[PDB]
Structures are given as C-alpha cells and as structure tokens.
Amino acid sequence: ACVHHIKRRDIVLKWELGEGAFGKVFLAECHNLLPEQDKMLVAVKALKESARQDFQREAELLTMLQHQHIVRFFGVCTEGRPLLMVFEYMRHGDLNRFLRSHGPDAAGGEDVAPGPLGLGQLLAVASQVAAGMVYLAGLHFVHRDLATRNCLVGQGLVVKIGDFGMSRDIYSTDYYRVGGRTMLPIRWMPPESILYRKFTTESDVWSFGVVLWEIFTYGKQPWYQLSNTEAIDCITQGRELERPRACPPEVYAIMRGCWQREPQQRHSIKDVHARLQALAQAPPVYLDVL
Numbered sequence: 001a002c003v004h005h006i007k008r009r010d011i012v013l014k015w016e017l018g019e020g021a022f023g024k025v026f027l028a029e030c031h032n033l034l035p036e037q038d039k040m041l042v043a044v045k046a047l048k049e050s051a052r053q054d055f056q057r058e059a060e061l062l063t064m065l066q067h068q069h070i071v072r073f074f075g076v077c078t079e080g081r082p083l084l085m086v087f088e089y090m091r092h093g094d095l096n097r098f099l100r101s102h103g104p105d106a107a108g109g110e111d112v113a114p115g116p117l118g119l120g121q122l123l124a125v126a127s128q129v130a131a132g133m134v135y136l137a138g139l140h141f142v143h144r145d146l147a148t149r150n151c152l153v154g155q156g157l158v159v160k161i162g163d164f165g166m167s168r169d170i171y172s173t174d175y176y177r178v179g180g181r182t183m184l185p186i187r188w189m190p191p192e193s194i195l196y197r198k199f200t201t202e203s204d205v206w207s208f209g210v211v212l213w214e215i216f217t218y219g220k221q222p223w224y225q226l227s228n229t230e231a232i233d234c235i236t237q238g239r240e241l242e243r244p245r246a247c248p249p250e251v252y253a254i255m256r257g258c259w260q261r262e263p264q265q266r267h268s269i270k271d272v273h274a275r276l277q278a279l280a281q282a283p284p285v286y287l288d289v290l
C-alpha cells in the first residue's frame, strides 16, 4: 500500500460535478500538491458506503498505473470519512460529451475550432486512447469497459483513459443489466465476451475498435438503432458496424483489424497505435487526400 496520502486540511471542496451510486465527484482546490503550483484544481471522488477494501484496491491499482494517457491519480485522504481519491481535473470532461458537442448535431473555443473536429483532430484523440491501451496491455491489465464515456479530455485536448462507476448511472443505456447486479457494455464487447464470458487484451482491442467508431461518429451509440437483445444477436451473428461518413477507408481498415472474429486474428494494440499515430502526425497534404 505505497499510496500517496494528502491531509484533509489541504483539500477544499468547491462543488459537485457528478454522482454515481458508490461515489460522488467534486471540484476542489488542493494545496502543496505540486511545488510548480502552491494551489491547484482537482476532482475528488468521495466514497458512498467491503467498500473500504474496494477503495484500497482501486487506490493501490491507480498508484501502479501511471502514464501520459491514463487518468492521473494524486492519492487518498484517509483522515475521517468521507474517504477521498484525488484526481487531475480534466477541463472538457468525458470524451463522449466532448465528441457530441463538436459533432454536426451539436462553437470554437480555446483548444478547438468551431464545427466538426477535423480528421487530424480525430486521429490525435484515437492515437492518445490507443497509447493508453498499449500501456495497459504492456501490464497485461484487461480494462473490460473501454468506451469514450470512460475517457476524459483535458486542456490542449489531452485525452486519458479511466474506468468510472458513475458511467453506469450517467450512461446506463450503454449497459445491459443482467440478473439485477451486473452491467454489461454489450455494444462494446466482442462475441467471445458475450458468448463465453472471456475478457482479454484481445476483447480490449475489439472495444478500442468500437471506440474508433464512436470518435468518427462524434459519439453516437454503436447499434443505436438496436435494442440490447437485437445488438447481442447482431454481434454474435458476426454483423459489423458501418463506416461512418467522416471515416476514410484507411481508418475503417484499422477498425476491421480490431473486429476479426478470431481473437488471435485481431491486430495488436501496439500495431493499431502505430497506424493511428502515423496518420495523426502525417502532413495535411497527405490527410486532405485520405
């Protein structure tokens, strides 16, 4: 348990940002956290209710996972309930909201032009999320719920991967509630995950595949035209998501790389990150003709 601790007195809650059923999130000022900044803004998750153990496991895990494109964890405040986890504040919030609000069905601020994000803007986002997934597959860590609702966008369109309990509330429609405890992101899962309940690196590249589709559809729900049971039938019957208008055939091919029926046929995430980075850093003259 080599988790950083922060004194309660160094955390000033400002207001709420989000509610789940296991946690509340707050904007807070945090003091003496960085020398660069004597004071600075963070998001703080307060535990609602076993629960303490889950909190200790979450904190140990998030102290392990550090990387440019994983949500930055600063540490815990264990001095009095509510127990707090302290996170970097991501000014644009979740990538799904960010996509929807820069999509044809939505103006231009500080980090972004008005109107649809450009192809180069969408490859940059896809690249960063892939960079994140490399680092997790690196550690042989299976995510199990990769989707735009579980990434955050910071100042400068820095995109980072998380896994938020509040996602099951805010975005319940993205989950199939089985039995009455469990919640399955069926629209993001490959056939082996739905059929055999196996979760692997390779079930995560499938999910990354669908993230790529979300990016290029500006955050539409995959199979939005289908019920949860229709999506299951269609995913088990091998039916593949259509190329979005904004998706060049060359990007659609990376998606197909992630959707090979056979887990082992799927391109590695390293390969995909490489394909996507290369495009995002390609000169406009090359991209304007893709």
Ligand SMILES: COc1ccc(-n2ncc3c(=O)n(CC(=O)Nc4cc(C(F)(F)F)ccc4Cl)cnc32)cc1
Residues within 6 Å of the ligand: 017, 018, 025, 043, 045, 058, 062, 065, 070, 071, 087, 088, 089, 090, 091, 092, 093, 136, 143, 152, 161, 162, 163, 164, 165, 166
């Ligand atoms: C506006 O700025 C905001 C807004 C919201 C937030 N915010 N809200 C909730 C959470 C939260 O739970 N975490 C921890 C987390 O993501 N945990 C995790 C990560 C992984 C892995 F994907 F990294 F691998 C796996 C498993 C778990 Cl449990 C972080 N930030 C949250 C933060 C800033």
